[PDB]
């Protein structure tokens, strides 16, 4: 943290943050969500980290260079250490990225190495070559070199993501799946794990071996797993929680801007809320059915009437304000809802869905006041505009993500937040073989468009191709876009250091401080 001159710091530097749900895991190679990343950034540090405004900045690597955007060399600071006092070296990164790539790990984020295009990743993921063929090498203890199969000018931007953080080989090999328990874990971030009681709390304490420890102010941070937004607000207002999670309750929000304006933070966020359709499950493998659902959803009612929290009605997957996005607004978005509704009814009727044979399907959502209130509104809208029957089903977070990867769903509430600010952070997830493809969408035309983005060497052609890939997605009606999120949360007046300026919301508790109160 960088404490301003004149600020008086509380004597007690502790923080309690709501984190939306129980984390899937603490192992950086097994996580895929925002709640998991929130804790991960405090415990494990990679090559680059974000500064308080969101810019990629030195983490374990103090400086890096590239040759033709294909060979990237990271110079690691010599005082980086793990919490047991041992040095963080380039060998840790070699081991870690090979473990990520290895099929035996089964990382849900294995494809992140394809997004960066590290040499040999495709063969490694396919079982054709061993993980030791990965194009990374330690030139010495402080020098990590990465070789890509193509020039990727934004490669370094990917490096702030948890799946490319290091894991300590000696703990992983000795304890297997229990390496993340408090007595076994070893960490290299500003904090270390003190306690983990499932469905109750996660408590982290400052890690004195952290290379930037002299600047860390908060000594202890607790993450809670409350998935009720209404309950998070109540415990915030009772004084128990200093920073809520950033999902806001329909029930109370508007009340809060009125009652506690200086505590409500509302900033741009690169995430999109949508209904994910299982594209390989009949009858959702018919484009007419997917298009009808997309058209009959009335976004004005949902965004402006039902939620009304500052979100923008969406017409694409990638948010239009992502760096490099120059998207074409589809013509259906400009139509009236009455025309969208008639066209949707026509399409469903062509699909064989009568009034004696109405389409019936489930809508799966992860436990939450917000998602439940929204799923109920969306089921009504669809019932009324299409005569469709929808059965609502809630699952806890870890189970919900699992169900989506397994394909045992019809339609699901979904939301994707960028991992780096560039349109491929969204678009790479719809690639046929992506480990993040939960829509189970498979399009050779789509895959080709994305592949062509690295064969050109100028931003305009790239941006044009990103726009055509969004159009392909929209033509196939792979998903149902609903709104582009805003990052809305409550933060006590005595929490310093949270700017709200990073659109990826990569907060690090090492940057915060408590003002005396």
UniProtKB/Swiss-Prot annotation:
User: What happens without the gene?
Assistant: Mutant cannot take up cell wall peptides.
Q: What are the recorded GO MF terms, alphabetically? A: peptide transmembrane transporter activity
Q: List the disulfide bonds.
A: 271-417
GO CC, one annotated term: ATP-binding cassette (ABC) transporter complex
Task: State the similarity comment.
Answer: Belongs to the bacterial solute-binding protein 5 family.
Look up the further comments and give them: Isothermal titration calorimetric measurements of the binding of lysine-containing peptides of different lengths to OppA show that the dipeptide Lys-Lys is bound with 60-fold lower affinity than related tri- and tetrapeptides (Lys-Lys-Lys and Lys-Lys-Lys-Ala, respectively).
Can you say what this protein is called? Periplasmic oligopeptide-binding protein OppA
Q: Which organism is it from?
A: Salmonella typhimurium (strain LT2 / SGSC1412 / ATCC 700720)
- Organism lineage: Bacteria, Pseudomonadati, Pseudomonadota, Gammaproteobacteria, Enterobacterales
